[PDB]
């Protein structure tokens, strides 16, 4: 199950600060984040959620976490 | 030609209101300056 | 104002997106 | 009342038992098809959907009449009433009729809560399929022991919810908020406060409670 | 594990899983019903009502997939 | 620049593509129909961002420029006491953004009682109009209605525009959205969040300028605009534009 | 939330200010650790094996009360 979770999720948990911009070439610079209702400027990053399927170590970690309950 | 006063004395420097209070051109109609 | 261009049909539509 | 020569109990042949059980899936997926949008929008598809409802009813209406026909109704020891889900059977359907029926006699101030027991219809299945009834009476008496564990669990939540009444009955009321006189602002997750009050620069000002007053 | 001498602690437990098998399928299948039925149930009283300005959440009553995957 | 280098409370959202000066040369006074899809689905987030849509697509309107605003749920209607196309000074705008704040969403949706509407309303000569650039917004989030026969009937030999906007972050079927844009000279956007609000607008006037260009010398003339506020202060000026093709 | 304090009790963490030694002023921006991983995953079974075997301890204590039967 954790072989089938990286040949499904493998570099797709990927995720831009700004939710407009979704590629790495778009995810430089500075926006403004409405989101927080107070208007401020933020940095926008390209990031993995914090709990992958990028590899099999991280496939079995994250999915160990799903056996546990919490966070699934 | 849609009246506003490009010059005129009673235009001064500050935003055209638009009703009672809770970037935008000032506009002052030549009927309404006079 | 006197004068304004729409509706040209030397125009290229296939640009909705 | 209890006329003989039924003509109805040589209908309950299996090539008729199992078209029930072929309508029956046919309308868990009607059911599972419907879309709810917001405030009285309905999808197209939604309201294509809605025609089919005459239908069903007008299948399972069927065989509640062929089966108080073939059958008794209450009085009759075997009658249709007498069987536990037969009961059940006859509610969705019932519930069917005037839920339908709310155009001619109006439902005369509104439901709202009728068409909440179509969602016994996959429960249908069961009760047209001996194969799970005896399965179904497996869990629910496995289970019939855990009826006092859980006497014994509401013994501990009544206990402890009273010693939450007589501890914290309302002393979850007051957050920290920003100076900032105007916009009060407070913490993403809240700082609730009390003879423990704010830590630096907030001021204890009234709150509804955690979350959103209900923990 | 056929080179061991755990394996007839093993298959056992596979030839006694087999043969009860359309016992835990008919059981699987009433664990099932009871998640629709609810899932329907749960999209009459919120299908619909978690347009929330803040956004709807994920753990929706709207559709159906999305009704199972919250009774679930 | 003028007061917002690096400084505290100060966010910079000037933007020269919103600016009056820049929507003046970069095309031809309009004539919108703002039309908002206020039925059930959008109820929510989706209104919130529709409205804020509206108010910011109504900023980019000058004196020139003709708008009324209508929205439809089974039925249209006008959102504020206007009933025709009128001028989108300042005191009519904020007429049309205080009736689309108070508007609220509930029912179905009829695209072609919404749609005849539109061009109804687009074909009232009885009133002052800009007689160029006819246009319909629709801000819709999406449905499976793409009402050919309507387009058909309305607008056959294509004089009105249309630009269909799907607000909101969900998963309607945009296929009926993205078809009415291609069919009827116009373009598709997208606002899935507050952050998307400000750009949209700034394209449809992307949109709107290629007439202006396929008129190569023609177009170019300088026009001024009213009296404004400089962005870096000295005052009351105006501006002369010419747009660079 | 167990794997937030896993995730928060990772390597490159601030670091208290410990107030007594005057080295690692702004050096020892390393106050959390990768370890964090070994530690977390394994209380988690650890801590779940040892109370299962104190549920059977306490079971199979009682497994004369547990199958008591009106017939015997
Ligand atoms: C540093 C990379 C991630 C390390 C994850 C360690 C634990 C992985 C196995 C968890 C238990 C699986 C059964
Ligand atoms: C003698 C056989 C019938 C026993 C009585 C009927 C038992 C099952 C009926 C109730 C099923 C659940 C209804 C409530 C919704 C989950
Ligand atoms: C059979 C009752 C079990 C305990 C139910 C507690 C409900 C608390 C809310
Ligand atoms: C003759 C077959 C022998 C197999 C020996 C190893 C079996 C190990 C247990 C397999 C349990 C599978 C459960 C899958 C989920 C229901
Ligand atoms: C405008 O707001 C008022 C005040 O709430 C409300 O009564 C009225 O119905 C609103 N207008 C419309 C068209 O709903
Ligand atoms: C406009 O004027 C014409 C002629 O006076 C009249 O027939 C028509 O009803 C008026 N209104 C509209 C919307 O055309
Ligand atoms: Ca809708």
């Avoid at chain 6, 703002?34 to 900023?59: A, F, H, N, Q």
């Avoid at chain 6, 704040?101 to 009232?124: C, H, M, P, R, V």
Wanted: net charge neutral; proline share 4%; aromatic share 12%.
């Amino acid at each position: 199950f954790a072989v089938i979770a990286v040949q499904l999720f493998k570099g797709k948990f990927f995720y831009c600060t700004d939710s407009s911009k979704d590629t790495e070439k778009e995810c430089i610079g500075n926006y403004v984040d409405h989101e927080k209702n107070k208007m401020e400027v933020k940095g926008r990053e390209w990031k993995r959620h914090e709990f992958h399927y990028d590899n099999i170590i991280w496939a079995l970690l994250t999915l160990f976490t799903v056996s546990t309950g919490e966070g699934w | 030609p849609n009246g506003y006063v490009l010059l005129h004395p009673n235009l001064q420097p500050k935003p055209i209101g638009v009703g009672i209070p809770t970037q935008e051109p000032v506009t002052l109609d030549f009927l309404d300056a006079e | 104002p006197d004068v304004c261009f729409d509706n040209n049909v030397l125009e290229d539509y296939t640009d909705c997106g | 009342n209890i006329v003989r020569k039924y003509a109805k109990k040589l209908i309950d042949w299996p090539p008729f038992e199992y078209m029930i059980l072929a309508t029956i899936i046919a309308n868990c997926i009607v059911l599972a098809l419907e879309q709810h949008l917001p405030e009285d929008d309905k999808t197209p598809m939604s309201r294509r959907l809605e025609k089919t409802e005459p239908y069903f009813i007008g299948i399972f209406c069927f065989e509640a009449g062929i089966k108080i026909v073939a059958l008794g109704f209450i009085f009759h020891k075997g009658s249709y009433l007498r069987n536990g889900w037969n009961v059940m059977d006859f509610i969705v359907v019932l519930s069917g009729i005037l839920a339908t029926a709310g155009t001619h006699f109006n439902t005369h101030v509104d439901l709202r809560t009728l068409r909440a027991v179509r969602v016994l219809r996959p429960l249908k299945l069961v009760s047209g399929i001996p194969s799970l009834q005896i399965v179904l009476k497996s869990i629910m008496k496995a289970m019939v022991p855990l009826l006092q564990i859980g006497l014994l669990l509401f013994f501990a939540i009544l206990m402890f919810a009273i010693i939450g009444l007589e501890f914290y009955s309302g002393k979850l009321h007051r957050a920290c908020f920003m100076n900032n006189s105007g916009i009060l602002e407070g913490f993403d997750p809240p700082h609730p406060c009390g003879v423990q009050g704010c830590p630096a620069g907030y001021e204890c000002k009234d709150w509804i409670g955690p979350n959103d007053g209900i923990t | 594990f056929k080179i061991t001498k755990y394996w007839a602690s093993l298959r056992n437990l596979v030839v006694s899983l087999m043969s009860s098998m359309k016992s835990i399928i008919s059981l699987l299948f009433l664990l099932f019903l009871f998640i629709v039925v609810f899932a329907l149930l749960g999209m009459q009283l919120f299908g619909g009502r978690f347009n929330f300005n803040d956004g709807t959440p994920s753990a929706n009553f709207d559709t159906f997939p999305a009704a199972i995957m919250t009774v679930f | 620049w003028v007061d917002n280098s690096r400084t505290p409370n100060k966010i910079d959202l000037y933007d020269v593509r919103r600016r009056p000066w820049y929507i003046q040369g970069a095309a031809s006074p309009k004539d919108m129909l703002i039309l908002v899809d206020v039925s059930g689905s959008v109820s929510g987030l989706t209104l919130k961002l529709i409205r804020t849509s509206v108010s910011e697509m109504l900023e980019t309107l000058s004196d020139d420029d003709f708008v009324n605003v209508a929205s439809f749920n089974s039925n249209a209607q006008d959102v504020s006491c206007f009933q025709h196309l009128v001028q989108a000074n300042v005191r009519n705008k904020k007429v049309l953004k205080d009736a689309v704040n108070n508007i609220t969403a509930k029912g179905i949706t009829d695209y072609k009682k919404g749609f005849s509407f539109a061009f109804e309303q687009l074909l009232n000569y009885n009133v002052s109009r800009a007689n160029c650039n006819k246009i319909i917004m629709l801000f819709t989030d999406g449905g499976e209605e793409r009402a050919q026969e309507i387009f058909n009937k309305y607008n056959k030999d294509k004089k009105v525009r249309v630009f269909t906007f799907s607000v909101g972050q969900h998963n309607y079927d945009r296929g009926p959205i993205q078809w009415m844009a291609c069919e009827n000279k116009g373009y598709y956007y997208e606002i899935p969040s507050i952050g998307a609000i400000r750009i949209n607008t700034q394209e449809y006037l992307d949109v709107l300028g290629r007439p202006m260009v396929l008129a190569g010398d023609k177009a170019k003339q300088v026009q001024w605009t009213n009296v404004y506020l400089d962005a870096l202060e000295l005052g009351l000026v105006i501006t002369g534009t010419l747009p660079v093709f | 939330a167990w794997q937030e304090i896993m995730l928060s009790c990772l390597g490159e963490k601030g670091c208290e200010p410990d107030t007594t030694a005057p080295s690692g002023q702004n050096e020892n921006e390393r106050c959390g650790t990768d370890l964090a991983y070994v530690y977390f995953v394994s209380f988690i079974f650890f801590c779940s094996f040892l109370m299962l075997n104190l549920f059977v301890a306490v079971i199979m204590d009682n497994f004369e009360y547990l199958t008591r039967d009106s017939s015997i």
